[PDB]
Amino acid sequence: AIRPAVKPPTIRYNMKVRAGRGFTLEELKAAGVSRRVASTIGIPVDHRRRNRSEESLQRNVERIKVYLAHLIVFPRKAGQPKKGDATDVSGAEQTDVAAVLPIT
Amino acid sequence: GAYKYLEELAKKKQSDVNLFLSRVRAWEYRQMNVIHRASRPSRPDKARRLGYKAKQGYVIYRIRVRRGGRKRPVPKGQTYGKPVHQGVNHLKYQRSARCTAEERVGRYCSNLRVLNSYWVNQDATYKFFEVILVDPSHKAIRRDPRINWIVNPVHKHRESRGLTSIGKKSRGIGKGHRYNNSPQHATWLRHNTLSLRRYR
Amino acid sequence: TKGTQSFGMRHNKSHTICRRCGKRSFHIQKSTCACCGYPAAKTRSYNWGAKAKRRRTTGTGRMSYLKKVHRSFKNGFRSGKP
Amino acid sequence: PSHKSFRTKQKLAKAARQNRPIPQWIRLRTGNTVHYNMKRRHWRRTKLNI
Amino acid sequence: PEYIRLQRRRKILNLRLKVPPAIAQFQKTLDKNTATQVFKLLNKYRPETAAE
Amino acid sequence: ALKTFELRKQSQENLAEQLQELRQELASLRVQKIAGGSGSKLSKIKTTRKDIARILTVINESNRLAAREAYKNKKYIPLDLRQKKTRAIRRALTPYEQSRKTLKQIKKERYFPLRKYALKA
Amino acid sequence: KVRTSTTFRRPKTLQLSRKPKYARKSVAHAPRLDEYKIIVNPINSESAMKKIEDDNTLVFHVHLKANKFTIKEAVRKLYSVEPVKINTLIRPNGTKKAFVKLSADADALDVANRIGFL
RNA sequence: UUGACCUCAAAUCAGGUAGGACUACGCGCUGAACUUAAGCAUAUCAAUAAGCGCAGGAAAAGAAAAUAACCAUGAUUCCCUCAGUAACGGCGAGUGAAGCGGGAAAAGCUCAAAUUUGAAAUCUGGCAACAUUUCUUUUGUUGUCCGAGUUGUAAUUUCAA
RNA sequence: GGACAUGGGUUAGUCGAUCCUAAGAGAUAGGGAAGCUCCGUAUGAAAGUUGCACGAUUUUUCGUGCCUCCUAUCGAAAGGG
RNA sequence: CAGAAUUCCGUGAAUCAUCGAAUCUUUGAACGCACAUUGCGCCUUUGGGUUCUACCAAAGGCAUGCCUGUUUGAGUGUCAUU
Ligand SMILES: [Zn+2]
């Protein structure tokens, strides 16, 4: 699953960036994704983490937006594309999320 | 509802009403058997918050347990060892009297599963507890998804394995540095196992 | 006196055949088997004696029903006619 | 002692039956080493112990 | 029997001892005529049965 | 050797009489073995024993089939006719009981189920 | 409610009988030890021959769980002879032997001839 | 007198359930001594051996009354590292974790506390019918009746709200 | 030859066991004990087997009622019988 | 060793393999009470011998703790019409 980019704690590791557990509720709200639908489309939700800085907030919502743009959602009803789904599922294939959204 | 009033009134155990009720009920329980079936819970709000429901398959049993420490069961205080292990009279059982109450009720009702228990009364000699049990063979329990888990065989005698609330309290299960000992045997094995890796 | 002539008065059994394990270890006066603990509702066992557990255990007898269960598990405990 | 229980008498019957010679055609089976054994019990050498 | 003795000595024990007022207030009850009038009013307003 | 495909055709009472005739034949064979035996009859002793076993098997199969027919469409069935899996399997929760869900859970799976999705590079 | 005794005793209850909703066993077992399991084989040793030819008694190899009633019934329905007395023995090999004396109106020699061990 | 309620009984009442065995691994209770300290009592062996209770295919733990003091992290478990370190110890002999970081795997949730109050909307059992089967052996549905339940079974809610 | 091999041999209403109880052992009620288990035998138990014609054609063991200090068992092949 | 030749162009030998139906003696957690005794009992049904009650035989049953429900009950526990 797609993971957020977080700053490790302590002064020994605060200069690096690693992968987090899940996106915060504020990040999902800014990206326009409901918490009940994020799990369905494979976006982890972390209720404990909070966005204390705009930089972290914008970084994570940018990751969600890139994930959403590159995401293909199969319609639940075949041949009946609903809202937010796609009708170009012919070319869908399994691809690594790390290549699309590396931790930079 | 009245459950909030019951919860707030149960805290005032030093009040005259609570003292009178505690005295008369303690006398009645002493007159009864050590373990006896209770037709209805004496603390419905406490039973509800511990998981009891007023439906078929839920059983309440009242048990009295002796108070005090645990004297070492040696013949004449003779331990036959170093002086550090010669104590006989000031030793304490590592499990709570509530744990002992759950274990004895579980053996008394081996066809049931011990769900929870709660303190109801005490005196100098005895502490009184009411134990909530669930029937795993009853259809009302086997068809309720909120209590369906206890029917699974992994929950057999969970009170004997220390899987109840008071059982995990006695085991010291918790989160944080204050519970670094964790499951004692598992932590001890992890810290005393010599890992000899394949250096190639 | 304590030896050869003393052995001549040994004609009173202290143990008899046990009805559970069959050994001549059932104490007559105590009505308890020194081997399996009959009639207590538990087989006598101790971890300091591992050879005794080796002597009597699963696999030392017939395992008549356990063999049937093992055979039935392979096909998933199926019923009916073939 | 001429005063024996049913269980004792059956055990004596089993012991007497076990203490019998093994037929030669049994030993003649191919790949068999059942020709001789020390399980022969005499009433004076080895005791039954009930 | 034990249960008969328990339920009789219980009432004896309540007769003894100083009962707190919050419990003793339930020993005062409506008289016969008011109780009859109250239940007559209640019987005109009863929940529907299974058939109803 | 008796054949099961005709023993099953034959009636229960007739099977009982045939069983008794086989039993007395086996008794006659055994007393012959005692008071002077011949190889042919000694070999036929085993065949008579198998024939008795076959008749008893057919009789028992017919009785069990009748019991199953009598207890068909009944809530409580004789224990020997019930399930013969392990004791733990019998005491385990049924798939219906395992699959029982609350109204809240049913709504959650109805409105937010796991979706089929893919990523394009 | 006058009590003339200074003791309380449990009253009497209906104690309804069992009316099961299902039979625990589907098929009733066949009668064990009817006639053929009771009577195994006759005995034709020298002592047995003397018993038949002198005391008018037949010697049998009855089952261990057969008593003098079942042996008498089995002999009656298998050989059409009425016993008058039956003596039971358990041999040192563990098998039960039966001495069955026939009535004066039946010769054990011809009965043994009919059975087929003479 | 009868009935209702409450409590307590009995029945070879209708239907069920528990015991025992296996203990390599698992969860607890109880619990030494040999030995080391060149003696020995605290210590060490060891929160071990023995004893006792209880499960499964894994068990246990688990979605913070958790870390941290950071630009902060974020359920549990396991591996490497932290680290033979902080620390404990006749500070003698000896003992000795945890945060961060990297990796394996990742999944979240359920109740009690609310007046459905214009309608106990909830559940068990008996009987009958209709379906189902790893299966005449399994598992349900509907109808009716009787019970449970207002000293509270259902529904929206569980703090992320 | 009490050895070896092959066969045969122990027949009970009256002889013993079986029945009873002794010293004792030991469930159950109940109380302790973390527990293996310990104490306890009408013990702080609603511990009933028994006594009686009320129905009953007409010459009888089938459903009530009222009842009174009964009581688990094991334990002797030399005790009792 | 023999026997099996009712066999082998056949539903058929084999201490064959597999296995979804059965049988499964006395015991054993062991379950009517016991047991150094194949000891002593009780209930239902069906049969035998003159025995509607005794005896014999066969078949089916009788342990404890606990849960839900049923029936019959007890209580100078709380109450209403009579
Ligand atoms: Zn034994």
Tab-separated table of C-alpha atoms and ligand atoms in Angstrom, chain C residues 17-26 32-38, ligand 1:
chain	number	residue	atom	x	y	z
C	17	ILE	CA	-2.840	-57.046	39.489
C	18	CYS	CA	-4.184	-53.601	38.626
C	19	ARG	CA	-7.456	-53.507	36.701
C	20	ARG	CA	-6.394	-50.457	34.643
C	21	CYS	CA	-2.755	-51.036	33.643
C	22	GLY	CA	-2.438	-54.764	34.377
C	23	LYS	CA	0.814	-54.534	36.337
C	24	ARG	CA	1.299	-56.200	39.724
C	25	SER	CA	1.543	-52.791	41.392
C	26	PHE	CA	-1.946	-52.334	42.893
C	32	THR	CA	-4.019	-47.629	44.918
C	33	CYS	CA	-1.826	-48.630	41.989
C	34	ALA	CA	1.804	-47.576	42.357
C	35	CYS	CA	2.236	-47.514	38.557
C	36	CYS	CA	-0.774	-45.727	37.039
C	37	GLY	CA	-2.475	-44.354	40.161
C	38	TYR	CA	-5.713	-46.320	39.825
K	1	ZN	ZN	-2.342	-49.621	37.489
